[PDB]
Coordinates of C-alpha atoms and ligand atoms in Angstrom, one line a residue:
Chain P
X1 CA 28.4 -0.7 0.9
X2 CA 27.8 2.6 2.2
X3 CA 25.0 2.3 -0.5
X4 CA 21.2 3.1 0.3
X5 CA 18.5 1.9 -2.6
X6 CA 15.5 4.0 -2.4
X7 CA 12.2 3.6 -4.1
X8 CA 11.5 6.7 -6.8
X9 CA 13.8 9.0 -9.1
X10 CA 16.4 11.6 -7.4
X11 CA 15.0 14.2 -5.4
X12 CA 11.7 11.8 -4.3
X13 CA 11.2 12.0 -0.9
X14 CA 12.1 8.8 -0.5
X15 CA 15.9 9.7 -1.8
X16 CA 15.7 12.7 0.5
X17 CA 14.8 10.2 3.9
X18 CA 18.2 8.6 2.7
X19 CA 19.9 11.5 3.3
X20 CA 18.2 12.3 6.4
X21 CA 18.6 9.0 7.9
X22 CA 22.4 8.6 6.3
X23 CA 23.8 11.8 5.7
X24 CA 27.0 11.2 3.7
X25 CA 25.4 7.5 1.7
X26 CA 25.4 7.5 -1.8
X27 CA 21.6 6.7 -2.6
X28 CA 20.8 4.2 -5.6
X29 CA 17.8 5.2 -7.2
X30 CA 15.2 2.0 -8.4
X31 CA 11.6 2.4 -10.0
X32 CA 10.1 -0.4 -8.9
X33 CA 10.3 -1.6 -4.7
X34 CA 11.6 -5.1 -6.1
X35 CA 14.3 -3.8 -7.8
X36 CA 14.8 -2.3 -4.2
X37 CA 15.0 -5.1 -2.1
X38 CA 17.0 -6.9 -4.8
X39 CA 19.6 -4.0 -5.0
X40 CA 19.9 -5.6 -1.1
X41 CA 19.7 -8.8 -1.9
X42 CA 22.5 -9.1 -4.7
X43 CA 24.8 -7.0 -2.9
X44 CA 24.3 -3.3 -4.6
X45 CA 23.4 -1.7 -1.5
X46 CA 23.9 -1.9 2.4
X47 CA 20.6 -1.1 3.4
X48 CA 17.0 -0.6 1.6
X49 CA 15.0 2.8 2.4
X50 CA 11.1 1.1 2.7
X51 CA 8.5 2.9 3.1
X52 CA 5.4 1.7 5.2
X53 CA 3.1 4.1 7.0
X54 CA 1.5 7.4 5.7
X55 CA -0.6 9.7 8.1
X56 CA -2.6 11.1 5.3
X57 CA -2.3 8.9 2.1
X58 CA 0.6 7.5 -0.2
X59 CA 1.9 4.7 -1.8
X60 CA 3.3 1.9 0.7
X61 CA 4.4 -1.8 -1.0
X62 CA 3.3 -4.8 0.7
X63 CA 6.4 -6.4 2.7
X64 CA 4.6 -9.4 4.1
X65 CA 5.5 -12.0 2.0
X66 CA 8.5 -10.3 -0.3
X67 CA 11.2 -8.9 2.6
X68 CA 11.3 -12.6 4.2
X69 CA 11.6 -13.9 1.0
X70 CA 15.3 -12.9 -0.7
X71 CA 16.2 -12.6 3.3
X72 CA 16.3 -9.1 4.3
X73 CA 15.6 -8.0 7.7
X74 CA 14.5 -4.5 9.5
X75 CA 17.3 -2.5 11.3
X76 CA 15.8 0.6 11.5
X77 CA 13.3 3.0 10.8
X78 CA 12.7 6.5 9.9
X79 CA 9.9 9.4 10.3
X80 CA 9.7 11.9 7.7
X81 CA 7.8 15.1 7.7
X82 CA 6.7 16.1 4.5
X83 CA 7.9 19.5 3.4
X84 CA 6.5 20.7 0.3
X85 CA 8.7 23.8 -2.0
X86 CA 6.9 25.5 -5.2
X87 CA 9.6 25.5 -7.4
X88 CA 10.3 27.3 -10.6
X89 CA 13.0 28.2 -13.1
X90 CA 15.8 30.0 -12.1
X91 CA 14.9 33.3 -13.5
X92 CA 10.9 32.8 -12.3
X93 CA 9.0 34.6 -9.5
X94 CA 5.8 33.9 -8.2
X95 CA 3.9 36.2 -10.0
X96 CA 5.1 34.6 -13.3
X97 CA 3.6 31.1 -12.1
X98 CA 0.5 29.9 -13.9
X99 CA 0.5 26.3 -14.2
X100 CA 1.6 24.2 -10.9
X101 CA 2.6 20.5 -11.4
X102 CA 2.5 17.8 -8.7
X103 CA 1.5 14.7 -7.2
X104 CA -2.7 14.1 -7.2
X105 CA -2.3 14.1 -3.0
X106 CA 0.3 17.0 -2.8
X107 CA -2.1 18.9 -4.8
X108 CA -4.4 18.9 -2.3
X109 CA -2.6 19.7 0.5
X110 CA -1.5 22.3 -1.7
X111 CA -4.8 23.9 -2.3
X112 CA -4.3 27.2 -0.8
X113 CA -1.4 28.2 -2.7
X114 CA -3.2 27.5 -5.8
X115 CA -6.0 29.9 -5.3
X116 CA -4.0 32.3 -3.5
X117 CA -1.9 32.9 -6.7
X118 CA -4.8 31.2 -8.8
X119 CA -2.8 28.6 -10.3
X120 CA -3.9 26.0 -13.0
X121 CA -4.1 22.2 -11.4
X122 CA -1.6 20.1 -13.9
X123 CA -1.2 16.5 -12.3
X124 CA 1.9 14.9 -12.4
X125 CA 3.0 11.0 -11.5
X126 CA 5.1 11.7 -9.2
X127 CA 6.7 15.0 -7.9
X128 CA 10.1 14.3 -8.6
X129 CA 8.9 14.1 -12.0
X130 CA 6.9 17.5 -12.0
X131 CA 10.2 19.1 -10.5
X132 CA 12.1 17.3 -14.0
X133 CA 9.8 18.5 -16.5
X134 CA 9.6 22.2 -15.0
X135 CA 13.3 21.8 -15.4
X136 CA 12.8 20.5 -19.3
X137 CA 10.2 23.1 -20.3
X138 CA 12.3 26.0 -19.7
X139 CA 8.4 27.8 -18.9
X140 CA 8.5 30.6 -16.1
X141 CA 4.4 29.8 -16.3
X142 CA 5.1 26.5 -15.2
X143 CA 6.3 25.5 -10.9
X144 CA 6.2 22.1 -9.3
X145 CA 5.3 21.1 -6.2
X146 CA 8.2 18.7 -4.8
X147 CA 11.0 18.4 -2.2
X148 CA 14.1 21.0 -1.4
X149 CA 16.3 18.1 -2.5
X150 CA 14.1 17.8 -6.1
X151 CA 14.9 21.4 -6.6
X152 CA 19.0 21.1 -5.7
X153 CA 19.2 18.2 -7.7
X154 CA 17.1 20.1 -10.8
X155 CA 18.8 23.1 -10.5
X156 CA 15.7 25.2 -10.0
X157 CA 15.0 28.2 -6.8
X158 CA 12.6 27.6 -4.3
X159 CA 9.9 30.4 -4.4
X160 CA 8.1 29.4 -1.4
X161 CA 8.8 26.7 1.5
X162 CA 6.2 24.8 3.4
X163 CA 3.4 25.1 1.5
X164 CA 1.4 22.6 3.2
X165 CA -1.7 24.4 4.5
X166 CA -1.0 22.4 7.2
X167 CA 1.2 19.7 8.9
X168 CA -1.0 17.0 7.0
X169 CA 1.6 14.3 6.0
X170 CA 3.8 12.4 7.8
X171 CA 5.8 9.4 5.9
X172 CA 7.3 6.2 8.0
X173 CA 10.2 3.8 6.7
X174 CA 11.7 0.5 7.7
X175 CA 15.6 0.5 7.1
X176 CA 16.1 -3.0 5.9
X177 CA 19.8 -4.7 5.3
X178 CA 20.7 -8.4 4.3
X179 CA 19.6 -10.9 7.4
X180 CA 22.6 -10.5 9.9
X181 CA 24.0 -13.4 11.9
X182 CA 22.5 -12.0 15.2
X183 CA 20.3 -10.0 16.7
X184 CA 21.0 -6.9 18.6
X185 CA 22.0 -7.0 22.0
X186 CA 19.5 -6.7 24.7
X187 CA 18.1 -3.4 26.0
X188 CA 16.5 -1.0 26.2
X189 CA 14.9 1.7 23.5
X190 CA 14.3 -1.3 20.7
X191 CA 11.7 -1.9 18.7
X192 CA 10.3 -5.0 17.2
X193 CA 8.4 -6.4 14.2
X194 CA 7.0 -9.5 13.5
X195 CA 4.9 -12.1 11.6
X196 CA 2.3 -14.4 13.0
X197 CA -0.9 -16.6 12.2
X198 CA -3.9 -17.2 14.3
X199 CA -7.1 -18.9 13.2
X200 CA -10.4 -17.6 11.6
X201 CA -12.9 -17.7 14.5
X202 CA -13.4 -14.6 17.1
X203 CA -11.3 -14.1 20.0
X204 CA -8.1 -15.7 18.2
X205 CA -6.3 -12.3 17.7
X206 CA -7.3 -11.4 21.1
X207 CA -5.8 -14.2 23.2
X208 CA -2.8 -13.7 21.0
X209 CA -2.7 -10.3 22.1
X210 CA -3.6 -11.0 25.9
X211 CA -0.1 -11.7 26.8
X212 CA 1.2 -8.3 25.3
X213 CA -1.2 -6.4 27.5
X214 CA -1.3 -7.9 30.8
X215 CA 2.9 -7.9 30.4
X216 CA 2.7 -3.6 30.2
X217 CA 3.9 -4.3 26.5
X218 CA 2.9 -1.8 23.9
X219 CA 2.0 -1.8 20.1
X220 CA 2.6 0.7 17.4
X221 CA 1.5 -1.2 14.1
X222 CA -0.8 -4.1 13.8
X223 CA -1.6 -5.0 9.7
X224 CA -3.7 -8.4 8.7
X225 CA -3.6 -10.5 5.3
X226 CA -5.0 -12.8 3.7
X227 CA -3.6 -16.5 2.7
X228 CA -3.7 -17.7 -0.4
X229 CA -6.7 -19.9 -1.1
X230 CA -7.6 -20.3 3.1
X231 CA -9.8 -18.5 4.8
X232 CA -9.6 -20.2 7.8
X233 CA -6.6 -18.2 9.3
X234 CA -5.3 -15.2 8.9
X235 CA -1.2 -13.4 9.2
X236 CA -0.5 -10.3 10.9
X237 CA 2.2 -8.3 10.7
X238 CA 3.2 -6.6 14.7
X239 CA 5.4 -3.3 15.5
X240 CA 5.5 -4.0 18.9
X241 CA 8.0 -2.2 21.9
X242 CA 10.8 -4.3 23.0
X243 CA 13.7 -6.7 22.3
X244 CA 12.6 -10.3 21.8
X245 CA 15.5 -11.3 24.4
X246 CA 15.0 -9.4 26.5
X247 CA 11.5 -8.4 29.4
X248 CA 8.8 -7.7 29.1
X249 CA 8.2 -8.4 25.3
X250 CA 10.2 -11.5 25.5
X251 CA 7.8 -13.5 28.1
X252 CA 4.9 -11.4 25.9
X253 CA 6.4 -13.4 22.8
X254 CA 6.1 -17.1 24.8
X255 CA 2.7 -16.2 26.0
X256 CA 1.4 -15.3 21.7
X257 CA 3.3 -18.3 20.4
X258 CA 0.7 -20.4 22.5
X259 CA -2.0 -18.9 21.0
X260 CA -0.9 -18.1 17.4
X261 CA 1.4 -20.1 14.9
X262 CA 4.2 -19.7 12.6
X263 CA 5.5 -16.9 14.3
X264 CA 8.6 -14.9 12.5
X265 CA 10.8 -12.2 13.5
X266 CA 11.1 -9.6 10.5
X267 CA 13.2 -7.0 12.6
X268 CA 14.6 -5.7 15.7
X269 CA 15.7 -2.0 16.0
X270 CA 16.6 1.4 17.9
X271 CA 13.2 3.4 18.3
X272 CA 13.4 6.4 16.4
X273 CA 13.6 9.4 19.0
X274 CA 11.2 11.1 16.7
X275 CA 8.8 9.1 18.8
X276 CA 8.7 11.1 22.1
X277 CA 9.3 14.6 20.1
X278 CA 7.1 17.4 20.3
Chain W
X1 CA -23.5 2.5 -15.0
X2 CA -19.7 3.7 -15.5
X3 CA -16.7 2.0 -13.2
X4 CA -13.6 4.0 -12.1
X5 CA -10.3 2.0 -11.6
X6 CA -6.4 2.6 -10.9
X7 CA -4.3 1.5 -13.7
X8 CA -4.6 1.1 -17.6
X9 CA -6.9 -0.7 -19.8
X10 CA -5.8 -4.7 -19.5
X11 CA -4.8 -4.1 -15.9
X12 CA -6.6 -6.6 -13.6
X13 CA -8.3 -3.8 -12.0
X14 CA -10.1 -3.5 -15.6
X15 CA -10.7 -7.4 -15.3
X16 CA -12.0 -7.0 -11.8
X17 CA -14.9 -4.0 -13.1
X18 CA -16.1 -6.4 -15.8
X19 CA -16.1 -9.5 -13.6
X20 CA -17.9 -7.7 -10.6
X21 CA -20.0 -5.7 -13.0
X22 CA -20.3 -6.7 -17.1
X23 CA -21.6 -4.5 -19.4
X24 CA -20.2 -1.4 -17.5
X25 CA -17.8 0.9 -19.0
X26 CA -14.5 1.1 -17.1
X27 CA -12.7 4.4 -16.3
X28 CA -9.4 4.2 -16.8
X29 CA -7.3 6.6 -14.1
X30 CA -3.9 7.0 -13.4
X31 CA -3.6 8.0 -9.5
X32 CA -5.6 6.4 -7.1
X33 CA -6.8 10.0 -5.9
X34 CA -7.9 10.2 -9.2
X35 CA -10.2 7.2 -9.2
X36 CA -11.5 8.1 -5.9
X37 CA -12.4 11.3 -7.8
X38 CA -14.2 10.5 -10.9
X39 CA -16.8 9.4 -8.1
X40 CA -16.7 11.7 -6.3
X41 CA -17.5 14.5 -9.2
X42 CA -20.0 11.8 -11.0
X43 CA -17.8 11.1 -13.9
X44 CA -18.2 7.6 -12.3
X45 CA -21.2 5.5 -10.2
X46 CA -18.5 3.0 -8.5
X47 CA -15.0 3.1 -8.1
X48 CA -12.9 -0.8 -7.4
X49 CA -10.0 -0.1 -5.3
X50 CA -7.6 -2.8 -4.9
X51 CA -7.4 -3.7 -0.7
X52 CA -5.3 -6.9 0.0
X53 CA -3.1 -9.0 -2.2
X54 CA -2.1 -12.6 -0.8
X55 CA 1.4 -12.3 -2.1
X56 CA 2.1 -9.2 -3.2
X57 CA 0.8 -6.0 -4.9
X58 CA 0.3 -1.9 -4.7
X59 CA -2.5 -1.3 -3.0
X60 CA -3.8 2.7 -1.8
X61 CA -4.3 3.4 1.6
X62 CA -8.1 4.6 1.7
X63 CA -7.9 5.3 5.5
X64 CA -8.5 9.1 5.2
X65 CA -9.0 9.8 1.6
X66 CA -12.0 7.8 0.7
X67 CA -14.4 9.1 3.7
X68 CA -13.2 12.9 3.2
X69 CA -14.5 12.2 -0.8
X70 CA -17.6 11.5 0.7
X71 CA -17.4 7.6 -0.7
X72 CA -18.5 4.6 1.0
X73 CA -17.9 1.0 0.7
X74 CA -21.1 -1.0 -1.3
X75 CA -18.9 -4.7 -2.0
X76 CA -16.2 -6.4 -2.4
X77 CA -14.6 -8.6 -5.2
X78 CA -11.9 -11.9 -4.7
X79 CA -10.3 -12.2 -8.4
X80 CA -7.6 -15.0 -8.6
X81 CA -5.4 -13.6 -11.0
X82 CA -4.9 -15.2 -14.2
X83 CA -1.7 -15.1 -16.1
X84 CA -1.7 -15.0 -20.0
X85 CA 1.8 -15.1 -22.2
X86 CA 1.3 -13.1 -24.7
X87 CA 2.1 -12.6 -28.4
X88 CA 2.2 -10.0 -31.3
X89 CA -0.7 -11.5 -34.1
X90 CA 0.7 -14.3 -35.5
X91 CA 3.8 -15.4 -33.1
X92 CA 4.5 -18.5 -31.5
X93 CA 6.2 -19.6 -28.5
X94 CA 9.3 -20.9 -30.1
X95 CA 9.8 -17.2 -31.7
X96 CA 9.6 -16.0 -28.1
X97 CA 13.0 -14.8 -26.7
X98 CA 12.1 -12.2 -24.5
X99 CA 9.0 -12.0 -21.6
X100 CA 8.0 -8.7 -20.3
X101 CA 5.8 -8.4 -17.0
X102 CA 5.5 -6.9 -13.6
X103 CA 8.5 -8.2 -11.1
X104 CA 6.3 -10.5 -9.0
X105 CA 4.1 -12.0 -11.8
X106 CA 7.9 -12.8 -13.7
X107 CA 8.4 -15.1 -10.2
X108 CA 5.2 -17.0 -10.4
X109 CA 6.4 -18.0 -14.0
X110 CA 9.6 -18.9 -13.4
X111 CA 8.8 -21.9 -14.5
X112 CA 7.8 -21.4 -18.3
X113 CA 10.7 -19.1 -18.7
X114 CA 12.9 -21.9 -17.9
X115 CA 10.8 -24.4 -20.2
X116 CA 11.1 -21.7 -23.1
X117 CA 14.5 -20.1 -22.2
X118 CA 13.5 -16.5 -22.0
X119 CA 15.1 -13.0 -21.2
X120 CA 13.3 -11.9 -18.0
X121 CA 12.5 -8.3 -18.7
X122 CA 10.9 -6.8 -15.6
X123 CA 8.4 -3.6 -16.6
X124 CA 6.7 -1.6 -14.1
X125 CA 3.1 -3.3 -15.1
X126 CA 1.7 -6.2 -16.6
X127 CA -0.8 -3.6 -18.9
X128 CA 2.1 -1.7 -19.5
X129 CA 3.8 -4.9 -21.0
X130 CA 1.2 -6.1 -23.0
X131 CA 0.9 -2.3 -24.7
X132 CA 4.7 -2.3 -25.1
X133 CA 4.9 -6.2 -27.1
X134 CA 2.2 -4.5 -29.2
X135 CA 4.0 -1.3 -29.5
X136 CA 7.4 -3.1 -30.6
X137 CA 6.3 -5.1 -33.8
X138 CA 8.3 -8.0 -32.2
X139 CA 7.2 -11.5 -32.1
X140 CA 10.7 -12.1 -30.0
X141 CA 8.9 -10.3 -27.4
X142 CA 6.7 -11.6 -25.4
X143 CA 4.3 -10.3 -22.3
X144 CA 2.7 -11.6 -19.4
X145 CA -0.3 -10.0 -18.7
X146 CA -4.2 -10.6 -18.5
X147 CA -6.4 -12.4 -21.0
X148 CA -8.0 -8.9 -21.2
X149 CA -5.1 -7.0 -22.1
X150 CA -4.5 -9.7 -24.8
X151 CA -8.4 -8.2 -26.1
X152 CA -7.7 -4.7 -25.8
X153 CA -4.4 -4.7 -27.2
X154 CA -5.0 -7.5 -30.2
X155 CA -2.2 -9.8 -29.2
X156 CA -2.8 -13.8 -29.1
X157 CA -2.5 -16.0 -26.0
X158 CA 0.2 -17.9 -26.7
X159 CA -0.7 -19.7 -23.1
X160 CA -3.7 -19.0 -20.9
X161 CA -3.0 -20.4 -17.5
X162 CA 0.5 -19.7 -17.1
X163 CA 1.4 -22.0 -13.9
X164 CA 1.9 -19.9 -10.9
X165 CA 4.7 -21.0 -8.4
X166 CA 2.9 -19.4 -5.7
X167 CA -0.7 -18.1 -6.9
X168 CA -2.2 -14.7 -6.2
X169 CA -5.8 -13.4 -4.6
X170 CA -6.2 -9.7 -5.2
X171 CA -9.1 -8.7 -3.1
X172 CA -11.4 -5.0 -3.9
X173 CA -13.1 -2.7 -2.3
X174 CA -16.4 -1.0 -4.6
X175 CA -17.1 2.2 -3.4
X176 CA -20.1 4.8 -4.3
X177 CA -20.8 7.9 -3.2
X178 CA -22.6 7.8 0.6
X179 CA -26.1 6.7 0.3
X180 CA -29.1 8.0 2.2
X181 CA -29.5 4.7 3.8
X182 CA -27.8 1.3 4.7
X183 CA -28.5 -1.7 3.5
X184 CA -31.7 -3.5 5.4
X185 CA -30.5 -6.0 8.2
X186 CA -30.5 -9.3 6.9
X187 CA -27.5 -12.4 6.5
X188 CA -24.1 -12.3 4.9
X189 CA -23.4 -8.5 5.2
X190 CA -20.1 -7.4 6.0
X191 CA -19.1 -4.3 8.0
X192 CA -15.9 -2.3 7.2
X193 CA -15.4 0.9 10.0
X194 CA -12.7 3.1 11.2
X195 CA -11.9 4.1 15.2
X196 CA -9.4 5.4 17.3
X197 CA -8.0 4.0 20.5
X198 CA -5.2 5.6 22.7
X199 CA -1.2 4.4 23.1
X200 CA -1.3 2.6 25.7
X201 CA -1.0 -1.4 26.6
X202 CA -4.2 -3.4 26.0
X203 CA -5.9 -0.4 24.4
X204 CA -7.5 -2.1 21.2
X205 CA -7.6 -5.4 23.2
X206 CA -9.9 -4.0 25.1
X207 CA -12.1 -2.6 22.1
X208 CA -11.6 -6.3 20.4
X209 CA -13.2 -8.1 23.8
X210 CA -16.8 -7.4 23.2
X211 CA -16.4 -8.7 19.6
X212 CA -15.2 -12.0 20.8
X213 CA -17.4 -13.0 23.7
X214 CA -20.0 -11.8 21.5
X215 CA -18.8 -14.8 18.6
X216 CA -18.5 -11.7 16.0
X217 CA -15.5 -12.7 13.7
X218 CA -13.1 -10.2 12.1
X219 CA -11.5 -10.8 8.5
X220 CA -9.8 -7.6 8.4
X221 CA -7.8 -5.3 11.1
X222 CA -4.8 -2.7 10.0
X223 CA -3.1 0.1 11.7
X224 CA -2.6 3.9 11.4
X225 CA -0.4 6.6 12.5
X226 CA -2.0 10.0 13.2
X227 CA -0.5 13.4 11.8
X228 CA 1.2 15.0 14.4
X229 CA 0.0 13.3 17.5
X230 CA 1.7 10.0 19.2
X231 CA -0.9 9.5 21.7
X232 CA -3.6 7.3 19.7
X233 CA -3.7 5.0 17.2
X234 CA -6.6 4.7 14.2
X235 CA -8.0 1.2 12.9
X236 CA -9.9 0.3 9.7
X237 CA -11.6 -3.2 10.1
X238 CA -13.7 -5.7 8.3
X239 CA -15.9 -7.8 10.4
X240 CA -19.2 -10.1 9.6
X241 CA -22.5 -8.6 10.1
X242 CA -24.7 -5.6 10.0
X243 CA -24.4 -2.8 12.1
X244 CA -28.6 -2.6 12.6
X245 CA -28.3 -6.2 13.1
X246 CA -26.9 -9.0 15.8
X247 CA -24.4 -9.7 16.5
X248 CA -22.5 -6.7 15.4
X249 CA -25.3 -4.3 16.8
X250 CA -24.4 -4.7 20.6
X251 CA -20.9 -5.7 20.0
X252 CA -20.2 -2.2 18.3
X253 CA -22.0 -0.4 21.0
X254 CA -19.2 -1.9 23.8
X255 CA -16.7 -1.1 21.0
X256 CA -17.4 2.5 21.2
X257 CA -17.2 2.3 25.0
X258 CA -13.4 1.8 24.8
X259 CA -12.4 3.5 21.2
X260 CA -13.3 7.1 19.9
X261 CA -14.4 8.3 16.6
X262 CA -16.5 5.5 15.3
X263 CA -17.2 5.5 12.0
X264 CA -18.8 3.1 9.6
X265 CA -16.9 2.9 6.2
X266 CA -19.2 0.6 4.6
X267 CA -22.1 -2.0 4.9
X268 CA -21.7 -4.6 2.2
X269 CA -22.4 -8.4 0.9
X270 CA -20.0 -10.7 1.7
X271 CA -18.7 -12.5 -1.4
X272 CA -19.5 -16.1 -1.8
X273 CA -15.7 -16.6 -2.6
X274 CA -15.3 -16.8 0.9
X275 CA -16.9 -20.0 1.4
X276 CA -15.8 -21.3 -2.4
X277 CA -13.1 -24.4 -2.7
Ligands
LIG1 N1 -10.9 -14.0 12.7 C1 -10.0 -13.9 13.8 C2 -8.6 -13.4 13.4 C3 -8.6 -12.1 12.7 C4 -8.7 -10.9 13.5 C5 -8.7 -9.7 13.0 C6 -8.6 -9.5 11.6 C7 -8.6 -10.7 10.8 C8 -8.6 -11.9 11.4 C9 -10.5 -13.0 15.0 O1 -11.6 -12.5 14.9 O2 -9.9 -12.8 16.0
LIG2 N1 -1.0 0.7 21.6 C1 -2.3 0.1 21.9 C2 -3.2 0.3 20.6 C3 -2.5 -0.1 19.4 C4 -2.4 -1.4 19.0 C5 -1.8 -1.8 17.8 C6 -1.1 -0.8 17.1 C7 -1.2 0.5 17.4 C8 -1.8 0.8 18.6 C9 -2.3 -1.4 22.4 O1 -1.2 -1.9 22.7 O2 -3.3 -2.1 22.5

């Protein structure tokens, strides 16, 4: 209660969206994303910090099968832009950094930096960790690459922020909590996701989808998987605009159901603002 | 004739590289970016990148960084993954107290650990668990793991086909550096490609249109956000065929007339798993 679990060690940027998305939430760190769902499940935390869409690269679980299962459901989601710090020791400056620890993929958004100051490449799990073991070492020769909030946490001075080369990544959450009783009132602003099965033979996907589009009804994520030992249909996970109660997604929703099977509601939820931002 | 792959030796990303190619030396790497990289330098031929688990798994997402390494998708692999218990040399199962293994594969075996009364201890990987049962000199400790890690790490199989609850498919990508050419047109090929189409209603139904009437079946579709920009949406696929060859040939060109950015990712043999009981 009042409780976020995040996926990662303090200072990730995973624990950081926590405190983005709910500013004044204790955040549970949890190594593993079942451990994070399960800190939901059994009651440790209010709601789960998921992450599920990268615009460059990253590590996303698979939600399909395990967030139904245990009985969570999405309530909200979050957009992250990545900001990367070069951190160092306390008493460091830039000019004393020779070695720079990070992430393989913050590395190389990182690339710049490294031959501007002509730094030696040492990669790291996970930056969190990179920002902990310049922290340990007690080495002016030695920055990380890693979050504002991996610094705070660490103790160690920013010498430089944003230095992404460019915007390059962008990180998307679900917000998931313990199934509640009932949905959301109809409106407007709401998003939904959702799971559903259609057959293994061409146009199945497409009459499922015929309802959305004739109905003005617009998708943001669309994700197949495979079922275990059948190849003759396949699941789909659907972000799609709308409340499931309310027009034009709910007639939309009637309309797939015809043409598709098993279909599940996984979450309904405000629509992130960061959505119509320039 | 040396194999890159995610993980540690024992990992069923190891299994998959020797199943999909004996004889060849695996590459142990810990970051996917890594793997994609041992390729990309030459320190590797092929790199197997996990793609699609039918339960659960951690997969990469390949969407940008395996065409900006220059790579390019040459097969697939289906592995139905195969848990072992394992033992220090010389344990048993009624010394067992303990069982040490990746969070999902310790729900698949719920069942033994109920027939044995074991201590679920959950550890970030199935490798990982076998290394650490050898590690500890234990034979309270058990793992769950492959029969490969069992090899690699000297520990006995206390129990080979550990009975699932709900099985699991892990399904690979193999990727090599671009070649000159495609494959010749010919039967059971696959086709995996990125494109972009825009944020609006209908948008990739349209696209997907000329693949049906056309009878061109996809097994693969998945989304992507762009950096920046909320205007268009990118899409990796998997569908049957060749893109030199009908079906696919014409269907792609009517494809193109309602996405951007086409690009093939790969042209590959199907796997005769997907027609296997
Ligand atoms: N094979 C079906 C369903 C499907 C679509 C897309 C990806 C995977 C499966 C089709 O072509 O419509
Ligand atoms: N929004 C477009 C394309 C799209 C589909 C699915 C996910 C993301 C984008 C449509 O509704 O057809």
């Amino acid at each position: 209660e009042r409780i976020i679990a995040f996926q990662g060690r303090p200072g990730a940027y995973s624990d950081l969206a926590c405190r983005q998305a709910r500013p004044g939430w204790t955040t549970l760190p949890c190594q593993t994303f079942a451990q994070t769902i399960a800190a939901v499940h059994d009651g440790r935390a209010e709601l789960a910090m998921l992450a599920c869409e990268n615009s460059l690269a990253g590590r996303v679980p698979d939600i399909h099968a395990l967030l139904p299962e245990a009985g969570l459901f999405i309530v909200g989601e979050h957009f992250q832009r990545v900001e990367h710090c070069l951190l160092g020791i306390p008493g460091s400056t830039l000019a004393d950094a020779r070695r720079i620890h990070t992430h393989p993929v913050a590395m190389a958004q990182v690339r710049g930096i490294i031959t501007e100051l002509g730094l030696d490449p040492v990669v790291e799990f996970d930056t969190a960790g990179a920002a902990e073991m310049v922290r340990e070492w007690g080495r002016k020769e030695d920055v990380a690459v890693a979050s504002a909030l991996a610094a705070e946490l660490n103790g160690l001075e920013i010498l430089r922020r944003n230095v992404e080369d460019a915007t390059h990544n962008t990180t998307r959450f679900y917000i998931a909590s313990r199934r509640p009783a009932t949905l959301p009132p109809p409106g407007p602003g709401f998003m939904t996701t959702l799971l559903f099965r259609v057959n293994n033979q061409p146009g199945a996907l497409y009459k499922a989808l015929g309802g959305l589009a004739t109905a003005g009804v617009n998708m943001t994520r669309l994700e197949s998987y495979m079922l275990e030992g059948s190849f003759s249909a396949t699941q789909f996970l659907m972000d799609v605009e709308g409340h499931p109660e309310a027009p034009p997604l709910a007639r939309a929703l009637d309309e797939l159901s015809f043409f598709s099977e098993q279909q599940e509601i996984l979450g309904v939820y405000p629509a992130s603002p960061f959505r119509r931002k320039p």
